[PDB]
Amino acid sequence: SSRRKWNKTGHAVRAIGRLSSQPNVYIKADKQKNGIKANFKIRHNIEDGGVQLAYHYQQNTPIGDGPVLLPDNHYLSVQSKLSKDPNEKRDHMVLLEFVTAAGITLSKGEELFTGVVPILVELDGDVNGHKFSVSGEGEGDATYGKLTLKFICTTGKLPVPWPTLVTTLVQCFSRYPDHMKQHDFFKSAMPEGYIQERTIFFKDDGNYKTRAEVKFEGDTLVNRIELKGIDFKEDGNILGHKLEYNLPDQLTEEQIAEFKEAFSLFDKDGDGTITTKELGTVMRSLGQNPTEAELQDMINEVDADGDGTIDFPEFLTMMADSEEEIREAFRVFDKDGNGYISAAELRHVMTNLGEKLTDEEVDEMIREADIDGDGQVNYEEFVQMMT
């Protein structure tokens, strides 16, 4: 009864917690300056408990005098994975990010971002007078909203935590879906580029002020940054390195890469999106017959932006009970339903998915799974292979 009031009330307070837990980047036009502004919070986990808030204010304005696209209000949704290179002796960060635009219901610069673009990042910083520099290199693939980079502190040890520098260290690699392409300021500014400025307030601590130039130099997208940090506490969360480096129990880069390859089999036109047409094609080639309504409801189920298609980050979320999943997978492979996957059936399944492999490569797949040497893959063999 008292316990029921605590529960009731606690559920409500935890609900506001759960709802506020994953703040997106809120973008708005700035007509006056021919650009945009953005406002958002970042919650950095504190080692051993709690969150350090970082309140971001941002403005971007074009570098050139050309025309740009000035967007309606929308947001960007970001997923970030931080890691370490075990062979790297310098202070560093490996970063993987997926960013997609959303929040509007239902071509200048686009051509620069259709494939993989090399990226260079240079940062010179001063935090409480501690001078430092960072340089990073990698690739962006705006089709998947994907950025992959490795960063090095080129002045020795970073005097602030790596996670605090992530937002500072190329929003032109965000995936805007088709209906929102007219709201992509970032690409419209290219190749001449844009200036990005922010102030970032760390609750109960200091602030960063940054200015950056983001432009192409040849075929490379370059982000060159000046950062000044003031008013930080010597034993606070930033200067004290009390923030958690990476989120626990995320997927491996290698697992993500296998999911991307899997996504490819569906996205036959390579535009970074799975439509009902494409999902249907694959399902039908497998011997299944969804209706249009079933195909649509299937997509809706995982359609976070509500565009009617599955983009890669949405697919990754779904792929990120197990026994029953593996058993149903087995039936799809075992086309005639006799309890054995034959080399022929596997050949056919590969063709059905659009997976081009020689007959010898297929034989090697069976051989890897085929414990009892009958040249076929039974259910128990399939489970060992799948787990």
Please report whether residue 338 would count as binding Ca ion according to CB under 5 A.
yes
Token pair 């063999």 in the structure block, residue: 381
Phi-psi region of 313 (alpha: psi -120 to 50; beta: other; left: phi over 0): alpha
Q: Is 265 helix (H, G, I), strand (E, B) or coil?
A: helix
Min dist. Cβ of residue 161 to Ca ion (A): 30
DSSP structure class, residue 162: G
Pair 223, 135: CB distance under 8 Å: no
Per CB under 8 A, does 4 bind its own copies? yes
Contacted entry of Ca ion, its own copies, none for residue 258, CB cut-off 5 to 8 Å set by kind: its own copies
Site string for its own copies, 85-114 (x = CB under 8 A): -----------------xx-xx--------
Q: Which stretch binds its own copies (CB under 8 A): 145-153, 158-166, 205-213, 367-375?
A: 367-375
Nearer to its own copies, 48 or 235 (CB): 48
**CA-CA-CA-CA torsion sign (246, 249, 254, 257):** negative
- Residue 230 or 318 with smaller CB distance to its own copies: 318
**Applying CB under 8 A, what is the total number of residues that bind its own copies?**
82
User: Which of 31, 68, 311, 32 lies closest to 186 in space, CA to CA?
Assistant: 68
Among positions 308-347, residues that touch its own copies (CB under 8 A) are: 315, 318-319, 323-329, 332-333
Instruction: Assess 259 for contact with its own copies (CB under 8 A).
Output: yes
Q: In the bound complex, what is the minimum distance in angstroms from residue 89's beta carbon to its own copies?
A: 30
> 10 Å Cβ neighbour count for 70?
17
If one asks whether residue 65 binds its own copies (CB under 8 A), the answer comes out as: no
Give whichever of 230 and 329 is closer to its own copies, judged by the CB atom: 329
Work out how close the CB of 178 gets to its own copies at its nearest, in angstroms, rounded to a whole number: 17
- The pairing of beta strand 220-230 with beta strand 340-341: unpaired
DSSP calls for 278-323: HHHHHHHHTT----HHHHHHHHHHH-SS-SSSEEHHHHHHHH--HH
The residues in 368-387 that bind Ca ion, with binding defined as CB under 5 A, are: 370, 372, 374, 376
Which of 164, 31, 175 has its CA nearest to residue 97? Answer: 175
Q: Are 142 and 175 in contact (CB under 8 A)?
A: yes
Closest CB 170 distance from Ca ion, rounded Å: 22
Query: Which of Ca ion, its own copies, none interacts with 247 (beta carbon under 5 to 8 A by kind)?
Result: none
* Residue number with CB closer to Ca ion (82 or 319): 319
Segment 257 to 296, residues that bind Ca ion, using CB under 5 A:
267, 269, 271, 273
Closest CB 70 distance from its own copies, rounded Å? 18
Could you tell me the two tokens for 297?
Answer: 């409801």
Tell me the chain's radius of gyration from C-alpha atoms: 24
* Residues lying near Ca ion in the complex (CB under 5 A): 267, 269, 271, 273, 303, 305, 307, 334, 336, 338, 340, 370, 372, 374, 376
